Scaffold this active site. Structure first.
Site: not given
Length: 245
Positions: A74, A112, A127
């Site tokens: 991420c 995250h 995302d």
């Protein structure tokens, strides 16, 4: 090599320098998830002794993901995508979230890392760096139900957090992750502090996800899962994910 917008757009299969609109943002987001897989298999190799993300040069991550064609995690994929969107003219703000765990609790608060884009008076969640089943095109920051490729999404408010929730066909709403929108920061990437393998990518109409032996697919909202046994089938699935689309 040094960060380059044209090289990155070629890597993700986007033609030209599309205009800074919501239609472009939707296309960039979906193409990125189709072309650049999530892969944590070598993420430890790239960790900085100091655990400050700023000590990992952006060009190192750009070289691994864009130049060499590998996947990432991420704080690699969304860090690169933030920079791409900023260079393309978007007002991008970094945010961090706690991920819903299998036991139903949420994990560490800022585990995250992802982004928001404010565009034309509306905020969208962006995302391209989440391993599990999630949105292939940006979500509006709203509790109103949103529908994409057979799945439903909403971003509800609970106890000072915004919670991204997802509902595929035939199943109930489930949270994906939660975050505090007011902690968004245009420069937030600068402040980030750092055995199962996770690999995934989007498809034209869904997503394919391999977590250990657990293979998940969703196609137009219809989910199928299989715990892979055979070594050849396992390798074929890894190859399919990492080949991109």
């Amino acid at each position: 090599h040094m960060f380059d917008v044209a090289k990155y757009l070629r890597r993700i299969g986007v033609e030209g320098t599309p205009p800074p609109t919501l239609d472009t943002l939707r296309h960039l987001h979906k193409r990125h998830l189709m072309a650049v897989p999530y892969d944590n298999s070598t993420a430890p190799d790239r960790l900085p002794a100091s655990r400050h993300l700023t000590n990992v040069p952006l060009d190192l991550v750009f070289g691994h993901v864009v130049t060499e064609g590998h996947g990432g995690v991420c704080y690699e994929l969304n860090r690169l995508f933030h920079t791409l969107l900023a260079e393309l003219g978007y007002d991008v703000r970094m945010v961090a979230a706690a991920v819903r765990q299998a036991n139903g609790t949420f994990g560490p608060e800022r585990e995250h890392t992802f982004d928001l884009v404010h565009l034309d008076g509306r905020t969208h969640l962006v995302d391209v760096g989440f391993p599990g089943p999630s949105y292939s095109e940006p979500l509006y920051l709203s509790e109103e139900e949103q529908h994409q490729y057979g799945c439903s999404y909403r971003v509800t408010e609970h106890d000072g957090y915004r919670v991204v929730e997802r509902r595929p066909k035939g199943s109930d709403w489930q949270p994906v992750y939660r975050f505090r929108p007011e902690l968004a920061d245009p420069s937030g990437w600068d402040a980030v502090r750092l055995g199962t393998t996770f690999r995934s990518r989007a498809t034209d109409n869904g997503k394919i996800v391999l977590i250990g032996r657990r293979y998940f697919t969703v196609e137009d909202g219809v989910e199928r899962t299989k715990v892979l046994v055979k070594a050849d089938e396992f390798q074929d699935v890894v190859d399919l994910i990492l080949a991109g689309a």
